[PDB]
Amino acid sequence: ALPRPIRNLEVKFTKIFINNEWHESKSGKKFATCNPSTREQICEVEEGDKPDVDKAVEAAQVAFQRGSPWRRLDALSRGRLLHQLADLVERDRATLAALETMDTGKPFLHAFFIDLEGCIRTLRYFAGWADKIQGKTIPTDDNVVCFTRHEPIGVCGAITPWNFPLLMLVWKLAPALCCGNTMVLKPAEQTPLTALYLGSLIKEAGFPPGVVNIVPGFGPTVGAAISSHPQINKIAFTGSTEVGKLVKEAASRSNLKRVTLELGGKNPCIVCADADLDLAVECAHQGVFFNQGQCCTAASRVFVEEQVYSEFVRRSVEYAKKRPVGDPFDVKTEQGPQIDQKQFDKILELIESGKKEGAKLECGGSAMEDKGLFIKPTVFSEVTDNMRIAKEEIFGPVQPILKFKSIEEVIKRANSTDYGLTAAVFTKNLDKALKLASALESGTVWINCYNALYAQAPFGGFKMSGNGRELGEYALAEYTEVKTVTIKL
Template sequence: MASKQQTESLMAQCKLFGKKDLPIKYTSLFINNEFVPSIEGNKFPTFCPATGEKICDVEEGRKADVQKAVLAAKQAFEFNSVWRRTDASQRGRLIQKLARLVERDSEYLSQLETLDNGKPLAESLNDISDTIKCFEYYAGWSDKIEGKTIPVDGDYFAYTHYEPIGIVGQIIPWNFPLLMAAWKLAPALTTGNVVILKLAEQTPLTGLYLASLIKEAGFPPGVVNVIPGYGPTAGAAISEHMEIDKVAFTGSTEVGHLIMQAAGRTNLKNVTLEMGGKSPNIILKDADIDSAVETSQATVFYNQGEICSSGSRTYVQEEIYEEFVRKSVELAMKVKTGDPFHPDTTMGAQVSEEQLMKILEHIESGKKEGAKLECGGSRHGDKGYFLQPTIFSNVQDDMKIAREEIFGPVQSIFKFKTMDEAIERANDTKYGLGGGVFTRDIENAMYVSSRLKTGTVWINCFDVTLANTPFGGYKMSGTGREMGEEGLRQYSEVKTTIMKIAKKIS
């Protein structure tokens, strides 16, 4: 999540506000370095969330198209192929060139992301910046992946080295379309794998444009194949395919279960899952309250609340509870919801009508179950998929809005007495993606951090995700880790070689 200073800087530099009439350059499947129609001739529409109007039709990939992509990827991964014979340092140079091409076309990509996803243009610009950093980071790793020599008993020499897994299926979500593509592609390509990337049907446009840059960068045919399509068809075909060696998925916990089941029924493929969250954010009474209010709200409202690690459960110690709620409401009233291409906009549209309706259903349940609606709670405007920024106070742990992932700009504020009580309640969830604590006491900060059952803990900040730090969850928030050196391990097989040291006969 961008800081306030980063967002303001991007907005100050941006000359792109107001531009909406973009040329849509790529709408077909990308297989074997060519844009091709779907085999069955199916297409689906993609819509602008800010207006509800159709942008264009996109070719829909299905099982036959996935099979075609697998054949291309298989050929690209053959032992004597160009890709397998590419030096590790050259892989790094290709990824670095891809980063430079994304940077070159960042203005177009950011506008396309806002058009297709609905987020404010300043946030799209920040996503593109993080995309570039991700490619740059992993480009630097390509020729630095090292095994070990292992001292063993007897007359043996033992060592390990890392090999690519093979054909990797990657299924990305609609909330950060281009950035999530980078999170998946960069470590997979760095380690020498080949990829079939399935784009979300809600937001396929930036991923298809990225495919054109992959070709321009010089990646050999079949190394990256891009399939826009639906989960039950294209996604299922990837998950069940016997010749796909790994699946990496970001999305809902429900779909993650289906992918894991598919892997178990077929070839027991390696699976990485980054799934849902209901992240707790604990505000202790000694915290800098203004900073805590601002950051806690930003993590819920940024990207229209469509963030898996959003700190949507805000636990506030009772001594400062009323002040925290009051200041949160005052701040929420200053949020500018509307045209994502307008420079004053700070919150854009939900990605789809379906997503908007799901959020409104959660809001209604909160009101019915007795939470106090402090502000918002309704649709914003009469065009597009906009929602008012929403805050509930007096939220109880057994309410639906406290238990289920809302994936929208809805902040639930809970009251607690003691730190241990807050930790116990924070951990009482099926999720474990992220968590945070705000306090001036370093001992309390570390105490909370050591006891939260989450993959990431933020102290006096929230949702800071960096290319060189691992990201992933406990429990039903997922398996495995993305980003950082850990992200490389998810795309590598460890091979051990043991050699007998023969005694020379004199």
């Protein structure tokens, strides 16, 4: 029974969450969050700045202070708390999906069956990890006792983008909390509503005050305050590569806080001659056009082996025709509006760039109408490495298709980039599959699928696509400090 849309439900939580209490800005300033579809203003949210960040950091330090209720808890009890938060999230699943779609213009069905699903699963997983975070006892000498503890790093700041506001937020809160940290979170300016509702849910679930604080605001104000705050021990950022460099160098400059970075990527897609062409084309269509093409794992490059190149292109064009584009709450829609104007502007500008460099076009190339921010699915052909459509992270609906002959060739080409978030390989041949998986400088390598994210499997970027990892057991390493204890007898 697919739920029907929550038509016009009002917002309730719009203030700064600190010590389980709602506060007004120190300055009193407030900003507005708008609807990417209605093109009209949704509501107003408190606009925090450096003083509010100072207050939240103090709260988080007090909740983390030795002997605090949060510190004294059982590992199993922290896990139980995370499970409680997951239960609450599930109870209010439709409300959260509705807020998410209002804030991002994402299809309500997408928000219900993707964002919230991943949120719940991530919460459950890291809840399971809470009482299973184990260090080592080390052999050294007959008279010595040597072991390691994995302790919480302390206060952790989180900074998240607009494409998946809540999900990217859960990815950090879950592991950080199961390791017993305290947090200061900052949602994007565009989409702060889900984060504040989750703060209400955190309070309801019984987390001690000060363990999670939420301060909405703008990147250069609240973000900069967190990234260079002297009392924050860890920072986790997901966003653009440039702001990621800014954050990491601010952390280096301030207090040497540890940094996790989930950034962008020129994600390649590799189709081999022996592929299941139907599934390959379908998955490439998805990886290029899902969520309006605005996700960290967008396929920007598509290498096809000559033996099927033309056939692939043909089928690709075909598949692009039957793609729903309309109301986000529409049950038969797969693509909503864009986020703001700059992304739409530069997407059309680089479509125009590509058509002027010698690439055959077969689909779309314009905007449907001037009611929202919709673009027609575009499909390019006869693309080269030297073209901008093959070297710049697109972040939109466009499928540039290149041609290759050798395995070694496609390896060299795909790896020529500075990014390395994801890569996808489609082939039925065991040897080619495994050789490519081994050779691709990519943090995730999907084979005969796409967007296969799992709470149990680590996600992250090689090279300039990130530093640490989220999801999986690996996320735990970013939220713990190792201490050695050596005792002579």
